[PDB]
Inverse folding.
């Protein structure tokens, strides 16, 4: 069928594209009292109700490989939609779809080669890494309103990610959702933090932190084969419900004490009467835990992962040397002093608002990701409109050399890719056509580093401004948009059950 | 096409809300009948009591309701000025998008206009120093004499000053907590007996045999079980007699003394009663036993009081019996039940140690509406004094800030360059609706009044405004009407924030 | 419909004509198509014609065109600007009346803003004036006419011919001089560069008398209208002779009438002679044997214009062949009729300034009519510049300078007229608004940029670019318009608003 | 969109471009008349029904170009239509009309400069120049409907032009028409030839005639005799001219003899008695002739105006080298052999129908024109889409080079130029898009002589094939179409009364 849906989804995502974009408001059906305003197009794509099967398959083909790299969604979706619209114009001009597919395959190969050629290596120098990481953090943390708080995110994320120096710790990084103080400052945990209370019933500075890593926690109780003597036999003795609770507590707590561990971590909140039971028994159960905490304990101190814990050897003697708690925010938060930074980290923000912290954590997730692979990688390319328009220029150049009818499809690809910085300018309110045409002139006459400076709406020599985008995310968004546009285009008719 | 159309529709909805609310502005005011599903009537001169109960369909209406709620929770008064600024800015936006200039430039230009306007309002205002009681009382009387609550705000203004002085030294510019200074009622009474209660006023107790007052009260924070649980039914076996349930009855009679002996080694004096869905049970047959050896039960405590008492007397929150140690205990100076000027069983806590100097005001009155009007008067008095103390330098009101700000913002747009210049000019020349609204609600020709105010602000006095209690433009009377500078700051900042958010909003989508 | 709603609809119609005319402003004006009752078409951006040729079936639009016509000669280029400024003033007055202001109040506010704008225009003055040495400054001023329309070679010759004609036709130059008599003539044919200034009148001549002295130093001219050969008052005449010797007697009578009269006329100091109608070339052969340079076929209006040029009045019969009755020339010279393929003799009458005209040629009827309007506008602007030597920088610069002045003055009064003057300000702003709308650049960005440039730097010579010279200062651009011309434009705009702002017509 | 009719009235013309064109019908207005077909758009626009004033202006530009160029009025109209289509497309893209005008003018400047710098001057050569003249004339005449005898007409025309030796003369050829016969029956011959029947009375055996033009015959009863002059009287002057005119019979011989006579040429009827008197005198006077060709008589023979012999001695003699009259199959046609100007030739096409005849003489005028401005100013460009592709490539290079909004405008102008050979290929039935893509690639890689082989659809280096077009016509088509599209675009709305 015709691509009305594939361009409709792109149009509804377009105005959110990049910083200084346009917001969207999403509200629940039924006229209930619930709505939210968001700028990240990924949020709209997550919350969108895809009534068009073409739009559904487009957003699904994005989701498998767009949220992985981070922030590509607002670029891949819009580029794919513009490609589909230009190809709809082409098929209106009687250009067969397979010609367009071949032309776009070759054009994407050329654009990726041009991107690799234009990509600049920045390894082996620490200061270049520092400046590049702050620049890429600022470009990825382009979402918060407060510019000083923007810089706060930039510095915190950069210093959290750089201290690795090795293979990725993105599996171990976390951003704690605990509410703190001012909504304009950020923080990082010298030892990963939990929302668990400390001191009232458990020791403060826990030397010899055993850190048993449990999954099957006590919602109310557990069991061990002992020969229970239950007093609540039937409905005739409902008043004796408490009798078995003490046994079901002790017949596990005692054996865990013989295992040598009081540091029982589990996801499940051990209740107030069980709080009395555990506290008196001399076990410091931590009622919140996760896969991330266990794997951070593993990576930082040579530990391991466990599951279905019943047997003592099935979990590690996670001999953390000592654990304390810190006073950030309006809670008594345990703070694992033993697991020092350098191998892994966890970021915590101060601020008393969940909904702001939502966009915050989304932006830090996409950042932490791109930061992780670009440290794993070594190359980056000039961001803004410079990179995409450079690839569009390369596609235009090789398109002119193409003899086949797919030359028109190649030119259409170049125009669609050129439309992305056009949308960047349009969302920023500048004269889109003038900006994009003068950019085409500015880096078509050589001057490959020239880019569009969105901060003032003028031509900007991107070499010294420092606004750069990591090579991996650009290559991934290029290839993903190409393949998604191929998938959407190459289907001509649809049938339904 | 579609983005412009949807932005136009959003603007139209916001402007419809704002212009329906426009007539009800300021002390003079004029009401509407609310279009509701019950068909009743409203004679409420204010503007907040429409939005707070407005049937809102369009998301623009909802966002303007959030605007009004945020303004009220920030500073109280001005809840209609904020929405009317929003509506006027959206009308200017309608003009600007009619000419076709882009929304993002609108947002940036309005941010620049906001910054310069905040600078202007901070400039021309009177830098009154708030450090001593005479300045506080001057600010209080200037704030209260300009409203219709003057008759009874007089006796309570010095006491509110005393409360805010308890909270912090005014040399500390940090805002006092509105929620920390709680407002309570003791049923009935006269007017003058509304008195400051250092510490907290607590709910009424049950007086089987507990003492009415205790010096150096050892207040305990109790939330845990009371009895052998009557878990699911009153009888577990044949109901000929309570043969086995006698065991749990006498286990109640034993566990009550067990917990009282667990208490006396700590010394819990009072008992805040959480509801029966959290508690196992509550009845006189055990509350009497708790009472007779000095554990007084106080009825139906609520979470706000629990948080307040934790913040004041340091008793940590409790969910079980085993934490009966001194962490859940507080040691006050004196706790008394006072019934002067009409009997009342509300307990009082006095002279306890506290990191934050929380203070409450008890409210009295021959009628319930009088008590609640006194409560709202003290509420808005604390709002205005807190937004003054955290920002100083109160400003004259009555559209004078709007006239002066529009004039200097128009000249700022004159000196400013770029696309944003005409945007700021339109922002300024449309923001002047507030003095126009005062002129409309005062009977003067609104346009001529606005011109006269703008001319008088030019080449002359900048504090001249429209007087609502004498009539017309006035400059000689300095005390026309005065509001804390934060009132205008919050109005402009929240209005511009929401307007630029509306501009940022595009292509509304159902989930 | 009566009252404010009727006036609202009337403002709507005025906006309908105004925004239609809006795109035609300035040297970069976008053209308009006119199809007439006759069925002919023409492309033209000149406002005067596309009001005059335009008709709108609304009475206020008729008053629009009539009031623009009433100052047609007075204001040549402004024919677009006055209408667009009136339209913008009415568009702002629409909002003003929607706010409830009574129409005469905003009319008087527009009048007050007009006074303020005029007094502000008084503050900008250039163009020192001295008639002999003004040639270079005046051609720099006519550069505005040259660079705008289709004259790509920007002939300095047309600017020079206009300025010399206007400076010579009145020896006194101080004020309000009598430049009403001059006019420009043209016809399809050779290149646009085929022009010549005459201190007299160019006649139309047939191509008889081929090699005869078309150039003679005749101080006096024979204006004898008597038929040397049989006359034709739309009625032909007849010949009848008995024999060839009878025709030779006719020849000797013709010789009497030629040699005797023309000897007398040369005694009175004239050799060139007019004839009212020509009959045949064999009679012309006698005139050739008499070495007579002569012209004929002058029409009624043609010969009357020749009379007013030469001061002498027609001589139809023999008895009036005296010196006093014949018309003077002082000198006569001959110039090519087209480029080179045809030749014309031209009669100057330099001893009297009462007849100075400009001849121009063009390669097309559209070309010749474009030349007509362009040279008329150049003549108007040079006339209005020399009438009042004070000048202001154009290209929207003057309008926005007045916008700053009146907008800053709007805070000087307490009455309702404050919004009226603010409306006048952002309506004077339309000239760069629409002058960028019909140009390439974004309207508001450039308009506000130059408006703020006038504040960061005090010189009011800043305006939007209209020829893509790459500079926003108009002093080097020299797109300049007469100060009294700008005064007339603004005053006519204010009056043109007032004359339909106070109307509650049937 | 207000000027879509201007596009449409050129759209009804794009179906006729290229020698491999495709006809339409002129349906005669009303009844009482019959339809007739037409290949060339010159007759389409000539007497076309016009409904849009902008379309009317385009028609007038087409007529003006045809007047001042001759051939190729189809190309100007179709190019203007494509320009206006792309102009409306750009206006939809919110690009202002005046930017389009400025960019278009810059693009035409660059394209004309590149065309001039790329056109080939065949220059100083004789045999190669002979072959070049032959094939360029043949291909220029192949643009018309005629396909069979183009070569003969072109060879005869270049023979005449070589007799001119550079002195371009549209009137050196004498152009007589004769209905009936076949196209193969068309004949040229040297000298100035008359299609009348003179036989023996004015003999066909005479030498070095005195050629004159005399507009008064013996049937005119002209008054200018030695007798009485003209009179209007009946008393005693009724018919004395009838007695006088008997002197003319002898004067018409003796006056010229006194001036000096060997022969005489008169273009009007002569009464019998002077007919045998001239037969005895040796004078060859023609009964009638194409009086529009009096300038031709004056040129080829050196003759001058005699003022109808009112002044017998104010004229000079003509000359020739022989007088003859020949039976060409069916017409006993007069043959003034080798009149004073040797370049004189007389062309006759024996057309069975007058429409082939009229188009043939239009083509002959075009031939003599293009031979003039390609002999005195020898310049030609490769046709068949080669020139349009080359100038489109130049304009695209300018668009990539130039900053500002003008880049998109002139790129669209370049693609509108590309549409012209696209239209040619589409009318040819070939894979038009693929073919023009191949040609564009050939020029991009660099082949200034690459174009389309119209006989069988494929790209080819057009120098070997010998296909070409004259430079002047192509340059004038480009400039005129550009300025016509400009003058149409510079108008936003039409005002009617």
């Amino acid at each position: 069928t015709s691509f009305i849906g594939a361009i409709a989804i792109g149009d509804l995502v377009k105005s959110t594209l990049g910083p200084k974009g346009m917001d969207k408001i999403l509200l629940s059906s039924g006229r209930d009292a619930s709505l939210m305003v968001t700028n990240d197009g990924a949020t709209i794509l997550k919350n969108i109700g895809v009534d068009n099967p073409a739009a559904k398959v487009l957003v699904d083909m994005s989701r498998v490989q767009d949220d992985e790299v981070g922030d590509g969604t607002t670029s891949v979706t819009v580029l794919a939609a513009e490609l589909l619209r230009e190809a709809e114009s082409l098929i209106a001009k009687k250009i067969h779809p397979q010609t367009i597919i071949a032309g776009w395959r070759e054009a994407t190969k050329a654009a990726r080669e041009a991107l690799l050629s234009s990509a600049v290596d920045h390894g082996s120098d620490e200061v270049k890494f520092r400046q590049d990481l702050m620049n890429i953090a600022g470009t990825t943390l382009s979402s918060k309103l407060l510019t000083h708080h923007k810089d706060h995110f930039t510095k915190l994320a950069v210093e959290a990610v750089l201290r690795l120096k090795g293979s990725g710790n993105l599996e171990a990084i976390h951003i704690i959702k605990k509410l703190g103080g001012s909504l304009a400052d950020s923080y990082l945990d010298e030892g990963f933090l939990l929302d668990k209370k400390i001191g009232v019933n458990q020791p403060k500075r826990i030397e010899n932190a055993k850190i048993l890593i449990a999954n099957t926690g006590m919602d109310t109780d557990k069991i061990k084969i002992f020969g229970s003597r239950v007093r609540v036999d039937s409905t005739a003795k409902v008043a004796e419900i408490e009798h078995a609770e003490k046994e079901k507590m002790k017949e596990k707590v005692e054996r865990i004490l013989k295992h040598g561990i009081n540091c029982f971590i589990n996801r499940q909140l051990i209740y107030n009467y069980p709080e009395q039971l555990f506290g008196a028994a001399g076990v410091m159960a931590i009622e919140h835990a996760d896969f991330a905490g266990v794997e951070r304990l593993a990576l930082v101190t040579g530990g391991e992962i466990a599951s279905t814990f019943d047997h003592p050897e099935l979990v590690k003697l996670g001999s953390c040397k000592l654990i304390e708690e810190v006073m950030i925010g309006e809670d008594k938060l345990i703070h694992f002093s033993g697991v020092a930074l350098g191998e892994a980290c966890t970021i915590v923000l101060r601020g008393a608002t969940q909904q702001i912290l939502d966009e915050a954590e989304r932006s830090l997730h996409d950042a932490l990701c791109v930061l992780a692979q670009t440290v794993k990688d070594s190359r980056t390319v000039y961001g803004g409109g410079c990179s995409e328009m450079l690839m569009a220029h390369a596609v235009t150049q090789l398109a002119n050399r193409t003899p086949g009818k797919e030359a028109v499809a190649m030119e259409s690809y170049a125009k669609a890719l050129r439309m992305l910085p056009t949308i960047i300018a349009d969302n920023a309110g500048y004269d889109s056509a003038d900006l994009v045409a003068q950019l085409r002139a500015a880096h078509s006459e050589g001057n490959t580093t020239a880019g569009l400076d969105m901060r003032e709406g003028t031509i900007g020599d991107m070499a010294i401004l420092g606004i750069t985008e990591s090579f991996q995310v650009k290559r991934q968004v290029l290839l993903s948009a190409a393949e998604a546009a191929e998938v959407i285009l190459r289907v001509d008719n649809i049938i339904k059950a | 096409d579609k983005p412009a159309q949807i932005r136009f529709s959003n603007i139209s909805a916001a402007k419809a809300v704002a212009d329906a609310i426009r007539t009800s502005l300021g002390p003079k005011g004029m009401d509407k009948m609310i279009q509701d599903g019950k068909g009743d009537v409203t004679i409420t001169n204010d503007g907040a009591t429409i939005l707070k109960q407005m049937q809102v369909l369009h998301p623009a209406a909802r966002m303007l309701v959030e605007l009004s709620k945020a303004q009220d929770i920030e500073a109280g008064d001005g809840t209609t000025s904020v929405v009317i600024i929003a509506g006027s800015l959206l009308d200017s936006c309608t003009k600007l998008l009619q000419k076709g200039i882009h929304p993002t430039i609108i947002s940036e230009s309005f941010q620049k206009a906001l910054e310069k306007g905040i600078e202007i309002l901070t400039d021309m205002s009177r830098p009154v120093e708030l450090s001593d009681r005479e300045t506080l009382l001057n600010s209080a009387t200037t704030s209260l004499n300009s409203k219709v609550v003057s008759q009874y705000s007089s006796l309570l203004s010095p006491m509110s000053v005393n409360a805010v002085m308890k909270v912090i030294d005014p040399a500390t510019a940090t805002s006092v907590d509105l929620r920390d200074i709680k407002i309570v009622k003791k049923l009935g009474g006269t007017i003058d007996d509304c008195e400051l209660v250092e510490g907290l006023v607590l709910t009424q107790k049950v007086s089987n045999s507990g003492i009415t007052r205790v010096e150096k009260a050892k207040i305990g924070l109790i939330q845990f079980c009371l009895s052998a649980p009557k878990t699911d039914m009153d009888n577990q076996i044949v109901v000929s007699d309570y043969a086995q349930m006698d065991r749990v009855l006498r286990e109640e009679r034993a566990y009550i003394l067990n917990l009282v002996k667990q208490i006396k080694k700590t010394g819990c004096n009072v008992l805040l009663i959480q509801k029966s869905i959290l508690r196992d049970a509550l009845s006189d047959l055990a509350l009497h036993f708790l009472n007779k050896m000095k554990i007084m039960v106080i009825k139906d405590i609520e979470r706000e009081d629990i948080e307040f008492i934790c913040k004041t007397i340091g008793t940590k929150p409790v969910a079980h019996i085993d934490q009966f140690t001194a962490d859940m205990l507080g040691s006050a100076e004196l706790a008394e039940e006072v019934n002067l000027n009409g009997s009342g069983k509300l307990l009082k806590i006095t002279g306890c140690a506290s990191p934050g100097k929380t203070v409450t005001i008890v409210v009295r009155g021959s009628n319930k509406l009088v008590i609640e009007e006194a409560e709202r008067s003290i509420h808005d008095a604390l709002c205005v004094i807190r937004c003054l103390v955290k920002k100083r330098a109160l400003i004259a009101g009555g559209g004078a800030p709007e006239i002066e700000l529009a004039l200097r913002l128009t000249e700022y747009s004159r000196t400013l360059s770029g696309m944003e210049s005409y945007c700021v000019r339109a922002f300024a020349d449309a923001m002047e609706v507030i003095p126009s609204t005062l002129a409309e609600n005062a009977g003067l020709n609104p346009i001529s009044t606005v011109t006269e105010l703008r001319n008088r602000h030019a080449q002359g006095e900048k504090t001249a405004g429209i007087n609502v209690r004498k009539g017309g433009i006035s400059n000689i009377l300095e005390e026309l009407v005065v509001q804390p500078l934060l009132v205008s700051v919050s109005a402009l900042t929240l209005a511009t924030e929401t307007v630029r958010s509306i501009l940022k909003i595009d292509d509304v989508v159902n989930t | 419909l009566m009252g404010l709603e009727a006036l609202k609809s009337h403002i709507m119609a005025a906006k309908a004509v105004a925004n239609t005319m809006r795109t035609s402003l300035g040297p970069n004006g976008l053209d308009k198509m006119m199809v007439d009752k006759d069925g002919d078409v023409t492309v033209t951006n000149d406002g005067a014609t596309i009001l005059s040729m335009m008709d709108v079936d609304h009475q206020i639009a008729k008053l629009m065109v009539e009031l623009s016509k009433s100052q047609d000669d007075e204001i040549g280029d402004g024919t677009t600007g006055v209408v667009v400024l009136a339209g913008a003033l009415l568009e702002e007055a629409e909002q003003l009346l929607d706010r409830g202001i009574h129409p005469i109040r905003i009319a008087d506010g527009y009048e007050q803003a007009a006074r303020v704008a005029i007094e502000h225009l008084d503050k900008i003055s250039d163009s020192v004036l001295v008639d002999i040495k003004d040639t270079e400054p005046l051609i720099q001023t006519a550069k505005t006419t040259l660079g705008s329309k289709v004259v790509n070679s920007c002939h300095r010759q047309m600017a020079e011919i206009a300025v010399n004609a206007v400076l010579t036709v009145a020896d006194m130059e101080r004020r309000d001089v009598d430049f009403e008599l001059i006019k420009v003539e043209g016809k399809v044919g050779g290149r646009l560069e085929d022009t010549k200034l005459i201190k007299g009148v160019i006649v139309d001549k047939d191509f008889s008398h081929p090699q005869m002295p078309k150039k003679v130093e005749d101080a006096k001219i024979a204006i004898l209208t008597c038929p040397f050969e049989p006359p034709k008052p739309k009625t032909k005449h007849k010949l009848d002779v008995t024999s060839v010797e009878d025709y030779k007697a006719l020849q000797k009578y013709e010789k009497e009438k030629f040699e005797e009269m023309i000897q007398q006329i040369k005694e009175t100091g004239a050799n060139l002679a007019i004839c009212q109608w020509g009959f045949d070339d064999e009679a012309n052969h006698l005139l050739l044997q008499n070495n007579l340079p002569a012209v004929r076929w002058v029409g009624g209006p043609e010969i009357e214009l020749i009379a007013i040029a030469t001061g002498g009045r027609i001589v139809p019969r023999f008895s009036e062949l005296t010196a006093e009755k014949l018309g003077f020339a002082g000198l006569v010279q001959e110039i090519s009729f087209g480029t080179t393929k045809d030749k014309m003799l031209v009669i100057e009458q330099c001893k009297n300034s009462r007849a100075v005209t400009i001849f121009i040629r063009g390669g097309n009827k559209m070309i010749i009519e474009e030349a007509k309007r362009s040279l008329h506008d150049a003549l108007c602007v040079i006339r209005n510049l020399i009438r009042d030597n004070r000048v202001v920088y154009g290209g929207g610069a003057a309008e926005i300078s007045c916008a700053l002045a009146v907008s800053q003055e709007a805070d000087k009064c307490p009455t309702l007229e404050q919004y009226a003057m603010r409306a006048f300000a952002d309506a004077l702003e339309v000239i760069p608004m629409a002058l960028s709308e019909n140009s390439g650049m974004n309207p508001i960005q450039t308009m506000t940029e130059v408006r703020a440039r006038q504040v960061k730097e005090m010189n009011p010579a800043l305006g939007i670019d209209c020829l893509h010279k790459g500079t926003n200062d108009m002093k080097q651009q020299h797109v300049i318009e007469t100060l009294i011309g700008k005064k007339q434009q603004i005053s006519l705009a204010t009056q043109m608003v007032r004359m339909i702002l106070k109307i509650d017509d049937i």
